[PDB]
Amino acid sequence: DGFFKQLTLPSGQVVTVSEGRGEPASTGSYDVRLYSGANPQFPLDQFIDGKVLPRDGSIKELKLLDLNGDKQPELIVVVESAGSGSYLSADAFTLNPQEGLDSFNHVEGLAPNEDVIQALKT
Amino acid sequence: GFFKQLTLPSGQVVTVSEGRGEPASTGSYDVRLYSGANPQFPLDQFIDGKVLPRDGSIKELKLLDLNGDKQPELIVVVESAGSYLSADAFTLNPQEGLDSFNHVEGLAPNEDVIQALKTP
Ligand SMILES: [K+]
Ligand SMILES: [K+]
Ligand code: NA
Ligand code: NA
Ligand code: NA
Ligand code: NA
Ligand code: NA
Ligand code: NA
Ligand code: NA
């Protein structure tokens, strides 16, 4: 099994993030799947929506931070290139009970010392 | 959890997966398309993917030309945990990528899913 992480949002919704099965470490895809989380004992029983995105590198971090000021965290998936420069890219998603899952922003080709969060707000 | 890889005669590669950790009876599946440009590395060149709901468990995959352009579409057939079939079809090509072709649902087990997907 490859990369898999499950997070519970403040609303009680549950999100999973996976890299594509059978893919190389250096490049491929990942998906984000949102669930209602209505029963925390069976958090993945009620699927809502999902997206598949390319990754130029490996997932390096998952962050839950409010980017748009609505008080709820967006999900940020930070990806680090296998290149010697370790260039960063990231996708942000809104995920909430009212709207479900949507893309918020995407950045790529960032130097390792760049402010990814500020870039995603830009 | 369902996982299957198919390779088209063009060389394109597709994988179909049920969502990890989900119930057998309900959840999601994803379809991922790769170029397969180097056939020894089928999953080295990702193109595009989609995540869909499944009302049931994946029964089988088919590759068949649904619109008569001589390229195969991908069909994902789903069986309810209860008896009904549903199915989603997708176009796949190097030129365009991955797109929805059609969707059918509430079919009897004996019905022709492929003819249903072809029929306006
Ligand atoms: K949405
Ligand atoms: K497309
Ligand atoms: Na891992
Ligand atoms: Na690339
Ligand atoms: Na927010
Ligand atoms: Na929003
Ligand atoms: Na919508
Ligand atoms: Na969207
Ligand atoms: Na066709």
| Beta pairing partners, A99 | none
Residue A86 φ/ψ, nearest 5 degrees: 50, 45
**Closest ligand relative to A49 C-alpha:** 1
Please check if A66 is assigned to a binding site: yes
* C-alpha of residue B94 to centroid of ligand 2, in Å: 9
Domains in chain A, ordered, with CATH?
1-122 (2.40.128.460)
Separation of alpha carbons B67 and A77, rounded Å: 38
Residue closest to B36 by CA, chosen among B11, B6, B15: B11
In angstroms, what is the resolution?
A: 1.4
Element (H, E) at B113: helix B113-118
Inter-residue contact A23 to B46 (CB < 8 Å)? yes
Inter-residue contact B60 to B79 (CB < 8 Å)? no
8 Å CB contact of B17 and A16: no
- Test the B interface: residue of A33, A41, A102 with most B CBs within 10 Å: A33
Residue B117 is given by DSSP the state H
> How, if at all, do strands B13-18 and B27-34 pair?
antiparallel
Element (H, E) at A79: strand A74-80
Separation of alpha carbons B86 and B91, rounded Å: 17
Technique employed here was X-ray
